[PDB]
Amino acid sequence: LTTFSLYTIIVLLVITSLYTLTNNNNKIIGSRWLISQEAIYDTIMNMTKGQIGGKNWGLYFPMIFTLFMFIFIANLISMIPYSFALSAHLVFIISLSIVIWLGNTILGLYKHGWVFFSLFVPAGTPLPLVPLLVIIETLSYFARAISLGLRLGSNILAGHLLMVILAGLTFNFMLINLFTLVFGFVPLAMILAIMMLEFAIGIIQGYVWAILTASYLKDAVYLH
Amino acid sequence: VSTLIPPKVVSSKNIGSAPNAKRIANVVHFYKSLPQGPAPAIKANTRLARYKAKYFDGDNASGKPLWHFALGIIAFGYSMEYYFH
Numbered sequence: 366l367t368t369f370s371l372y373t374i375i376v377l378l379v380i381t382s383l384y385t386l387t388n389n390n391n392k393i394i395g396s397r398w399l400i401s402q403e404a405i406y407d408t409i410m411n412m413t414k415g416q417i418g419g420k421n422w423g424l425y426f427p428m429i430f431t432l433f434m435f436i437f438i439a440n441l442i443s444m445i446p447y448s449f450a451l452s453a454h455l456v457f458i459i460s461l462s463i464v465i466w467l468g469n470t471i472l473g474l475y476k477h478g479w480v481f482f483s484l485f486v487p488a489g490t491p492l493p494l495v496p497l498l499v500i501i502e503t504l505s506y507f508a509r510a511i512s513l514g515l516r517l518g519s520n521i522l523a524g525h526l527l528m529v530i531l532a533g534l535t536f537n538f539m540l541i542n543l544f545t546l547v548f549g550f551v552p553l554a555m556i557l558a559i560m561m562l563e564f565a566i567g568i569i570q571g572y573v574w575a576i577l578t579a580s581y582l583k584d585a586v587y588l589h
Numbered sequence: 590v591s592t593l594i595p596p597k598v599v600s601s602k603n604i605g606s607a608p609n610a611k612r613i614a615n616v617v618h619f620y621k622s623l624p625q626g627p628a629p630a631i632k633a634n635t636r637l638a639r640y641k642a643k644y645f646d647g648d649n650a651s652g653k654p655l656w657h658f659a660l661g662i663i664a665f666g667y668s669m670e671y672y673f674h
Contacts, residue, residue, distance in 0.1 A: 389628075398650045
């Protein structure tokens with residue numbers, strides 16, 4: 366129904382194009398565009414074999430890949446001048462984060478029993494600070510519940526708002542008298558620099574999500 | 590005395606060396622080899638096989654499709670701006 370629904374469809378179709386005509390029918394030699402999707406493959410091969418390496422790392426390799434690419438595409442599309450809050454609709458992003466965090470907590474409880482609660486015993490510290498370190502390990506464990514979502518959401522939301530707030534101000538700079546319209550381009554160049562930074566930090570955040578929910582999974586699969 | 594019969598017996602030199610393995614590979618691969626491969630992608634037709642051909646072929650990766658793809662989404666919301674305003 367919603368505007369949001371239409372843009373979620375647009376994201377799906379963009380991702381399809383990355384493995385349908387970005388590919389040169391799957392050319393062994395590799396095309397200029399398909400080389401890109403090789404390098405992404407390699408840095409996530411070497412990252413999620415590196416993070417969640419072990420007996421199972423490839424078993425969670427599609428999951429971490431669809432968390433990379435989704436955020437990778439959704440922080441370019443949302444950075445188009447007219448394009449709707451998907452990642453600035455935080456309620457979807459944070460919910461997805463909590464779901465994955467719960468799917469780690471459940472995975473850990475299920476796979477590693479009630480000695481999953483040994484994850485919240487960090488070490489064999491002296492006995493008078495053992496109970497304290499259970500309390501503020503579980504606390505930090507469900508601070509991990511909300512941190513992952515709030516990272517991506519805040520970055521994207523703040524970026525769009527910063528650009529828009531400055532756009533309205535420089536509009537009124539170029540609406541007031543011509544001595545201000547001379548030196549009307551100088552603040553504009555600042556907004557351009559900010560737009561460059563916001564595109565950059567969205568890809569940086571895109572790597573940061575997928576390493577963090579590899580890191581939480583590193584903690585969950587391999588006890589402690 | 591009378592020579593032995595090994596020099597005139599051969600029957601396991603054909604597993605005896607490594608290029609035998611390569612041989613049985615490349616008799617299949619090369620015998621049924623094509624002179625050239627099939628395609629570097631070409632489908633997207635509807636007056637858009639040209640769009641892919643100009644922009645998303647191995648010929649070039651340049652910023653022209655990016656601009657085009659960006660502009661489609663801009664055209665959607667820009668028109669909708671006046672639907673909202």
